[PDB]
Amino acid sequence: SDLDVIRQIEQELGMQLEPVDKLKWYSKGYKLDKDQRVTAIGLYDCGSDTLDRIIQPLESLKSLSELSLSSNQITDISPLASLNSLSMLWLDRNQITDIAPLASLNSLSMLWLFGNKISDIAPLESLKSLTELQLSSNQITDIAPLASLKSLTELSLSGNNISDIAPLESLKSLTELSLSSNQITDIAPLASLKSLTELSLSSNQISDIAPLESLKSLTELQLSRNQISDIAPLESLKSLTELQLSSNQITDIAPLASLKSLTELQLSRNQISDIAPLESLNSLSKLWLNGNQITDIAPLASLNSLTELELSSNQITDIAPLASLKSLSTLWLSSNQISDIAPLASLESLSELSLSSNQISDISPLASLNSLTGFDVRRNPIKRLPETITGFDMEILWNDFSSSGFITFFDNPLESPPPEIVKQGKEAVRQYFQSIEEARSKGEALVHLQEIKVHLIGDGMAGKTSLLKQLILNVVTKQAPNIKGLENDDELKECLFHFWDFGGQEIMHASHQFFMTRSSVYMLLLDSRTDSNKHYWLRHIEKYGGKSPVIVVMNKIDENPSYNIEQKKINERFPAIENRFHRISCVESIAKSLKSAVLHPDSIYGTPLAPSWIKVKEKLVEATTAQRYLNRTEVEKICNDSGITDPGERKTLLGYLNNLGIVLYFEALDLSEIYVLDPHWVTIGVYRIINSSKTKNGHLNTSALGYILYTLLEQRYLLDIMKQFELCYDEGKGLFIIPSNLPTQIDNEPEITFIMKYDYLPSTIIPRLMIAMQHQILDRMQWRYGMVLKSQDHEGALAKVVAETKDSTITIAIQGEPRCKREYLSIIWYEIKKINANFTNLDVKEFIPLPGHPDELVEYKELLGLEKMGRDEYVSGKLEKVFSVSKMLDSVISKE
Amino acid sequence: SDLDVIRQIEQELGMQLEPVDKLKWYSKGYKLDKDQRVTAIGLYDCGSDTLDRIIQPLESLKSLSELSLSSNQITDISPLASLNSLSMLWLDRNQITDIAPLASLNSLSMLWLFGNKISDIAPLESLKSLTELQLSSNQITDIAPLASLKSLTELSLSGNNISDIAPLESLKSLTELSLSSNQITDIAPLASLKSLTELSLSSNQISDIAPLESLKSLTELQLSRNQISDIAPLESLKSLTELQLSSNQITDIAPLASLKSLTELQLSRNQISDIAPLESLNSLSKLWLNGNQITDIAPLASLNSLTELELSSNQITDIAPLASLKSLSTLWLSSNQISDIAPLASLESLSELSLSSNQISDISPLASLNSLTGFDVRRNPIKRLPETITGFDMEILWNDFSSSGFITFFDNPLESPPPEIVKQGKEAVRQYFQSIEEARSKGEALVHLQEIKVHLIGDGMAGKTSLLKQLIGEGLNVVTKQAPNIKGLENDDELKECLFHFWDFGGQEIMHASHQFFMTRSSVYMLLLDSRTDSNKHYWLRHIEKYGGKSPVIVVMNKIDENPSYNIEQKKINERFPAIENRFHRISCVESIAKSLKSAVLHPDSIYGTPLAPSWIKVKEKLVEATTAQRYLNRTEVEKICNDSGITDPGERKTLLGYLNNLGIVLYFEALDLSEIYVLDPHWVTIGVYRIINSSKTKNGHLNTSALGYILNEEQKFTYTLLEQRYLLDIMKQFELCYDEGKGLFIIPSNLPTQIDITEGEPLRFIMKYDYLPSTIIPRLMIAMQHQILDRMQWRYGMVLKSQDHEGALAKVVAETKDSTITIAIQGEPRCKREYLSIIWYEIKKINANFTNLDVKEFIPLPGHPDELVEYKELLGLEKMGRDEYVSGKLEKVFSVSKMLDSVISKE
């Protein structure tokens, strides 16, 4: 009964088909008429075993006109040849290689082949009734049967290997035509094709755009990612409303002054330096100008219809002309030389902003923009924030991106409030300004801190113990009068120094991101013997510490006075040293370098603190150093004895002391018996359990913490601390794995069918990654320098990432199905960059080896740079072989 | 033209002009006729001040017909237009760019423009009387104005930027044509020219050689450095006598069987695996087949006219077929799989041989070749040399090359005699065999040595003194303790007399320069690691490989009881450095290392395999006894010691002191010959030089002779007289640690600072990427080029150079320790810069040879970007592969490979 056929279909496939008014490519149902006859049916995403079956009920549908087989990975399309009455056929995003059964369908007017492996286009020649053909993203190289299938109006051949577009001269009935991401160099045949309204021609090799001067009906042109340097033929296309010619060599944009009907103009990665002709485009609303050399944006003041500007990566100094654009809603001014943002107070409709990488020191005028819903101000010399910054409808963050609805800070020399308070949200920034306001209202003069951590860095304690006696995990804290050099220096009689010695294992870098970056002074210890490993530790300081001041002291020079380093080139590479180089011989100049490092303006010394915050600080350090840890009632009795009654203050103050490393407080635990902990007590507890006999192989049994370490709950707290420190994880039944202590032997798995080269490979990059993918290991397949993964989501996907310490590279090798493997690398690579961001200035160059050779690598930026620009095949002189550029960038789909 | 005119010419220029019978390009004289009229004059190499003022006497020479201006760096040739009667003109190897004045010489039949910068050849169009044109080595791109002068017979266009040879189809009277080092891909216009007898087409992009099938008169073809894989069109050129198709893609050489008139065939760096067709070439005398895949050389037995074979870099196992080639005079069988060379004993005419990088263990059958004048046997598993090896007419050497008239050894596990005896020449190897022959005749049983040096390697003395405490107990400290004093071999009777020498060079390997065998032979390296010093793990592992080489190494990971999780990847580390032999240890609260020390002294490659005469050990123990008590020994003392053991022949004592000197047991400098200081104690010299290197007066690299007393005698045991100071400076000068500048001023390049105050103009950057950069590569270069430094512009990690040959040639070599690279930056003229680089780079590879297996990857940066470098092996590999474009995706620019390769070298 025709409709009972769909009941046969939803039983043969297992799915259920629901009616739809108009059949679409993604539809999972049928469409009947007035007399209940199926005229359209859709089977979106059902498997490749669909055309092999369900074809007999399809042939019974005599009135069937429209069929959709979108995205089924179909390889054989023979059974559909029996449907010579189809008017619309969707074969998009399948695995079709041979095309031929469609030749017997001389009644189709709509054909979609969005993502197949089509190398022959001949059988479409007999299809002289087509009006909309979609052949994008295939492997077509020679087109010719396209002049036969005339009378079509919409054609798409984007993402192929086409170099000759001559057969298109006959199809003078084209309304829409897209020819992007191909190998076109001659666009002469397009000089015909009248009544073309939408043309796309991005990512090609075109340079002569003269034939486009005749297309007077063009209203939407796309000429991006090409090699065009003369937009002169564009003076006549006065009907254009969307023009995009980004990533070219355009310098003169004079012709664009005649296209007064433009509404979306994109000319980015070009060489434009004079945007004067754009003054006439009063209807322009979307304008992109990133990556040019624009210095005067005065012509933009007449474009009162702009709603989305993009002036990033330029050289703009003055911003006054943008004040008259009261309708502007999206500004991107990153990477410029902007110093004053006061003219931005007149942008009442501005909602999203980005001012990263500039020279801004005051963001107070933006406090009037009550419609701002996400503005970015990273990498700017901002020292103090206005108190009105807590009145926005956004939460303040401390990250290295530009998220919508958040005030983001990063690489900012923040003093009021300091970065340790900014990362905790608005309520922390609000409680800091409220503390200094309540203190000064009481007539209390604000006090700084003068307390820093001295990180002793070097290979071997031979230079550490020789220097630690020259001045006077193991943390020794001695105040200023106990330092040989500034014994009676009244300028810092209250200064505190905390000497730490992490033997390469930076335990605090994972949890407390500010233990290594802020409130830290790094001290490199070098001599004639340990001069070989000189640049490794210098890079070890840069990635972990960053902008923290460094002191390079070369001791034991009286034994070999010829020992000296290249302080000029070393300081130019690491500006954090500030020429703090010393040579100890048998007068301590290092004491002057410690002074210049604690009193540094970028350090916490520049942060004004309330006097009550120092009162609870000195009391917590007094009680923690005497009672190991403190409980919740003890800490509240200390805060209440200093006027800190609001839980908002004490919650955001303990986080401040936690970020500095003075007193530890884990909010993710909330055990009132162990509220605040002594750093000297926990680090010793964690250092003994990691370097224990029972953990010599990386395996840790919970029923053994007593012998190593301390009550039973203190053991349960220390393992939660290690779990917080991203050093281990629980596998079940009291089985923990210390990923840093695992061996490197027994077995591997480099079976048959991508490297990230660090400048400095952190030794915690693999262990903290191994805990993030703990439920994906292939039954105890991890060891120290790698791991083996197996996804339950993607059936055919086996991964094995390994780190090479000799080359400081992490290679990832995955096998399985392309749609199931290329996705698995995108989830691992994202999780690796998620942890790479915790370091400072990491140089990651992604390489992919050549097919058939383990060595001889090619940069991912090179082959990706070879595509879109044109030319194929990456030639290797040392191998005398070509390997093709399109075959290797298979880890990405298409375009983006 | 008159003779008084040339007298004015040889006075205005300074040279002297002598008569010559026939004028040539290099002639520095004149040529008169019967009526004493100058009809030819030549001014070869006289200066750029020529023709601009000597043209007026040239115009007075009315009978002048031939003019030679060879090699004068001439830039303007305008005055030469007045000589419209010249028939031969030599303008070779100048700096000519415009040849417009040459159009008015419509009477020339000989024109040579050998090495100029000429991009336009249009004025030659009117020269319809030319029969010999030389336009090699220029910048010619369009050879279109060459079709008019169709009366030429000899044309040369090698070394240009030519890509279209279509205009050459008209000159159908060509007999000789050279068109090498261009960008040719289509040789179809060459399908004519039926009278071509000599054609050269090397270093191009040619792949279709079909048009060459018609040149039946061709007798000399050159088609090397191309992309040819089908030599079928060559089957008909039966008149060929010299064919060269090297560096191509040839696999089938069947057409060569038809060219039975071949006498010089070159097919190197191809893919040839079947050399059967060559059996018919009975006139073949010069044959090159290196770099192929040849496994059967049986067809070569029928080529009884071969005098120079070249079968290197193949896969040859059997060498028997070469026994019938009684006329062979030059054999090159390097880099193969040859194991037996006995069939080579029938090569009575063999004079030069090379068997390096093979599997040969016996060179005794070759002792019958009484005509051998230089045969190479490096990198072969040779354990013992035959005593007849001193009967050849050659001197024995120990180097990494094949010099004529010398027996060269290198990388050979020599036991009898050891390499320490081989380096002293043939007369030394003869004196070694003479001692063991006299010993066995006297009934004295031969004795081994059992003495090794333990090199303490590691960053920081924290682990060094901790390991020296594992035995009995403990800047340079030399402690020698025998086996029973070692915790582990207390009662080990297998080596109760074994001696151990513990050394600790604080990174500064003082002995590597002079005594090349102090680090390689009789040495055991011990790497000391702990949980903290694991970062600098691969630096020292490579530091051991480059300095020590094949010496056994023991990797000791100490302080593991503090962190039991500490252990290295012993599998991958041992596979990279096979000298480890899995000698990994983990010391916790030191006796298993003793078993590894035994396995390193008892090594077969060590000195245990060397049989010594019993008298050589008697004087050894006597010299060490006397040196350790009297510092140094004089000549009469050491000779009285040798005579007390029967060593009377000075040949033995000179080659025995040299043997002990190469091992580091007893120092003896033959290049000094101070009879008061003949033999020295190693402990005394090393302490003496270490005090001069780490002294206050040498903190800046400068050393004043009038201050040595403060250095060696008084600073915060031993005694150093004034003559001992003069000897230590000669020792340090021998150790390549310092050099003399004059007036008692020495420069220690290892103690120099790192100051400042780059290059601008026509730069030439060149980078050498080491896998391990030795800290003595720059100091030892500064001593080799001391008389070329630009005054007081020298520091530790670099130097500034200035060549005396090429005026203005300025160089600046710099070492980057952060990248372990040596950068060379020269400026000036290309012919004056690329020559200065060829002597600097050679002097660097001259010092690189002292190390073992160093990976030097030479890079050259792109011309428009200081960073972003490209490897020199890629650009050189693109030419052989056949392409002129290096594409850079991260830069989105294409770069011609010929513009940057010719900026470094051109003899390709």
Find out whether B749 and B776 touch, Cβ atoms under 8 Å: no
Residue contact A531–B507, C-beta within 8 A:
yes
Amino acid found at B88: M
Inter-axis angle of helices A426-441 and A647-660, to 10 degrees?
A: 110
What is the C-alpha R_g of chain A?
34
Answer whether A878 touches B (CB < 8 Å): yes
Please enumerate in sequence order all residues whose Cβ is within 8 A of that of B180, keeping only pairs 6 or more positions apart, or say none: B158, B159, B200, B201, B202, B203, B204, B222
Which of the 8 DSSP states describes residue A342?
A: G
Of B507, B531, B532, the CB nearest to A532: B507
The SS3 call for residue B703 is strand
The SS3 call for residue B429 is helix
Tell me phi and psi for residue B551, to 5 degrees: -70, 140
**Architecture of the CATH domain B424-448+613-677:** Orthogonal Bundle (1.10)
Q: Between the CA of residue A443 and those of A436, A440, A643, B181, what are the distances in Å?
A: 11, 5, 15, 88
Q: What are the domain boundaries of chain B?
A: 424-448+613-677, 451-609, 681-751, 752-855, 862-908
Map A261-288 to HEC letters. Answer: CCCEEECCCCCCCCCHHHHHCCCCCEEE
DSSP-assigned states of every residue in A198-241? EEE--SS-----GGGGG-TT--EEE--SS-----GGGGG-TT-S
Number of C-beta neighbours around residue B557 at 10 A = 23
What CA–CA distance (Å, rounded) separates B184 from A778?
Answer: 57
Number of C-beta neighbours around residue A8 at 10 A = 13
Token pair, residue B804, equals: 């005396």
Q: Between the CA of residue A787 and those of A131, A755, A801, what are the distances in Å?
A: 54, 15, 6
Token pair, residue B299, equals: 């067809």
CA distance A568 to chain B (A): 8
CB neighbour burial string for B280-298, b if at least 16 within 10 angstroms, e if fewer: bbeebbbbbbbbbebeebe
Answer whether B535 touches A (CB < 8 Å): yes
Q: How many H helices and E strands in chain A?
A: 18, 40
Q: Is the peptide bond before A189 cis (omega within 30 degrees of 0)?
A: no
Find out whether B44 and B20 touch, Cβ atoms under 8 Å: no
Tell me phi and psi for residue A318, to 5 degrees: -95, 140
Among candidates A500, A512, A492, A521, which has minimal Cα distance to A603? A521
Find out whether B378 and B330 touch, Cβ atoms under 8 Å: no
Rounding to the nearest 10 degrees, give the CA dihedral for residues B599, B602, B607, B613: 170
Answer whether B891 touches A (CB < 8 Å): yes
Find out whether A533 and A457 touch, Cβ atoms under 8 Å: no
Find out whether B544 and B524 touch, Cβ atoms under 8 Å: no
Domain covering A742-839 assigned CATH 3.40.50.720 in the classification: no
Rounding to the nearest 10 degrees, give the CA dihedral for residues A853, A856, A860, A862: -130
Of B533, B565, B569, the CB nearest to A695: B565
> Cα B273–B275–B278 angle (5° rounding)?
160
The SS3 call for residue A58 is helix
In the numeric block, the tokens 């629901």 are attached to A18
Find out whether A300 and A321 touch, Cβ atoms under 8 Å: yes
Among candidates B649, B660, B651, which has minimal Cα distance to B619? B660
Find out whether B633 and B680 touch, Cβ atoms under 8 Å: yes
Among candidates A873, A143, A33, A813, which has minimal Cα distance to B881? A873
Which of the 8 DSSP states describes residue A340?
A: -
Find out whether A116 and A95 touch, Cβ atoms under 8 Å: yes
What CA–CA distance (Å, rounded) separates B522 from B331?
Answer: 35
Amino acid found at A840: T
Find out whether A38 and A27 touch, Cβ atoms under 8 Å: no
Tell me phi and psi for residue A260, to 5 degrees: -65, -5
Of B694, B756, B878, the CB nearest to A562: B694
Answer whether B562 touches A (CB < 8 Å): yes
Find out whether B641 and B619 touch, Cβ atoms under 8 Å: yes
Q: How far is CA A610 from the centre of its chain?
A: 37
Q: Please provide the CATH number assigned to the domain covering B451-609.
A: 3.40.50.300
The SS3 call for residue B274 is coil
In the numeric block, the tokens 């923290």 are attached to A548
Of B539, B540, B878, the CB nearest to A875: B878
Please enumerate in sequence order all residues whose Cβ is within 8 A of that of A803, keeping only pairs 6 or more positions apart, or say none: A761, A765, A766, A785, A786, A809, A810, A811
CB neighbour burial string for B42-61, b if at least 16 within 10 angstroms, e if fewer: bbbebeeebbeebbebbeeb
Map A99-144 to HEC letters. Answer: CCHHHHCCCCCEEECCCCCCCCCHHHHHCCCCCEEECCCCCCCCCC
Find out whether B601 and B608 touch, Cβ atoms under 8 Å: yes
Residue contact B874–A877, C-beta within 8 A:
yes
Q: Which 688-747 residues of chain A touch chain B by CB within 8 A?
A: 690-693, 695-698, 738, 740-741, 743-745
Number of C-beta neighbours around residue B434 at 10 A = 17
Token pair, residue B58, equals: 């040239």
Secondary-structure percent of chain B, ordered helix, strand, coil, rounded to 5 = 30, 20, 50
Tell me phi and psi for residue A312, to 5 degrees: -80, 165
Return the residue in B527, B565, B568, B757 with the most chain A beta carbons within 10 A, the one to mutate for interface testing: B565
Q: Phi-psi bin for A776: left (phi > 0), alpha (psi -120 to 50), beta?
A: alpha
The SS3 call for residue B705 is helix
What CA–CA distance (Å, rounded) separates A297 from A320?
Answer: 9
Return the residue in B756, B890, B901 with the most chain A beta carbons within 10 A, the one to mutate for interface testing: B890
CA end-to-end span of chain A: 48
Q: Phi-psi bin for A537: left (phi > 0), alpha (psi -120 to 50), beta?
A: alpha
Sign of CA dihedral A459, A460, A465, A470: negative
Q: Between the CA of residue A118 and those of A100, A121, A762, B435, B783, what are the distances in Å?
A: 11, 7, 46, 83, 68
Which of the 8 DSSP states describes residue A857?
A: E
Q: Is B688 exposed, middle or buried (0-12, 13-18, 19+ CB in 10 A)?
A: buried
Domain B752-855: CATH class, spelled out: alpha beta
Residue contact B695–A561, C-beta within 8 A:
yes
Chains A & B: contacts with CB separation below 8 Å: 160
Token pair, residue B840, equals: 């600097």
The SS3 call for residue B669 is coil
Residue contact A562–B874, C-beta within 8 A:
no
What CA–CA distance (Å, rounded) separates A664 from A508?
Answer: 11
Of B461, B751, B888, the CB nearest to A529: B461
Return the residue in A456, A459, A464 with the most chain B beta carbons within 10 A, the one to mutate for interface testing: A459
Token pair, residue B105, equals: 């010489």
Please enumerate in sequence order all residues whose Cβ is within 8 A of that of A198, keeping only pairs 6 or more positions apart, or say none: A175, A176, A177, A178, A218, A219, A220
Residue contact A691–B887, C-beta within 8 A:
no
Q: Phi-psi bin for B35: left (phi > 0), alpha (psi -120 to 50), beta?
A: alpha
Number of C-beta neighbours around residue B865 at 10 A = 11
Q: Which helix (H) or strand (E) holds A397?
A: strand A395-398
Chain A residue with the nearest C-alpha to that of B565: A696
What CA–CA distance (Å, rounded) separates A357 from A347?
Answer: 21
Chain A residue with the nearest C-alpha to that of B475: A559
What residues in B contact A867, CB-CB < 8 Å? 889
Token pair, residue A585, equals: 């011989």
Among candidates B250, B897, B534, which has minimal Cα distance to A763? B534
**Do the domains B424-448+613-677 and B681-751 sit in the same CATH topology, yes or no?**
yes
What CA–CA distance (Å, rounded) separates B745 from B723?
Answer: 17
Q: What is the resolution of this structure in A?
A: 3.3
Q: Are strands A352-354 and B679-680 parallel, antiparallel or unpaired?
A: unpaired
Token pair, residue B842, equals: 């050679």
Residue B740 bridge partners (DSSP): B746
Q: How far is CA B810 from the centre of its chain?
A: 23
Topology given in CATH for the domain delimited by B681-751: Arc Repressor Mutant, subunit A (1.10.10)
CA distance A744 to chain B (A): 6
Number of C-beta neighbours around residue A50 at 10 A = 19
Q: Which 672-691 residues of chain A touch chain B by CB within 8 A?
A: 690-691
Experimental method: X-ray
Amino acid found at B323: A
Number of C-beta neighbours around residue A707 at 10 A = 9
Sign of CA dihedral B818, B821, B822, B828: negative
Strands (E), B569-714: 584-586, 632-633, 679-680, 702-704
What CA–CA distance (Å, rounded) separates B764 from A84?
Answer: 71
What residues in A contact B536, CB-CB < 8 Å? 459, 530, 532-533, 536
**Which CATH superfamily groups domain A451-606?**
P-loop containing nucleotide triphosphate hydrolases (3.40.50.300)
Token pair, residue A42, equals: 């859709």
Find out whether B819 and A535 touch, Cβ atoms under 8 Å: no
Residue contact B569–A692, C-beta within 8 A:
no
Of B532, B751, B875, the CB nearest to A504: B532
Residue contact A866–B883, C-beta within 8 A:
no
Chain A residue with the nearest C-alpha to that of B531: A503
What CA–CA distance (Å, rounded) separates A202 from A178?
Answer: 9
Topology given in CATH for the domain delimited by A611-730: Arc Repressor Mutant, subunit A (1.10.10)
CB neighbour burial string for B248-268, b if at least 16 within 10 angstroms, e if fewer: bbbeebebbebbebbebbbbb
In the numeric block, the tokens 């395996």 are attached to A699
Q: Are strands A110-112 and A132-134 parallel, antiparallel or unpaired?
A: parallel
What CA–CA distance (Å, rounded) separates B733 from B730?
Answer: 5
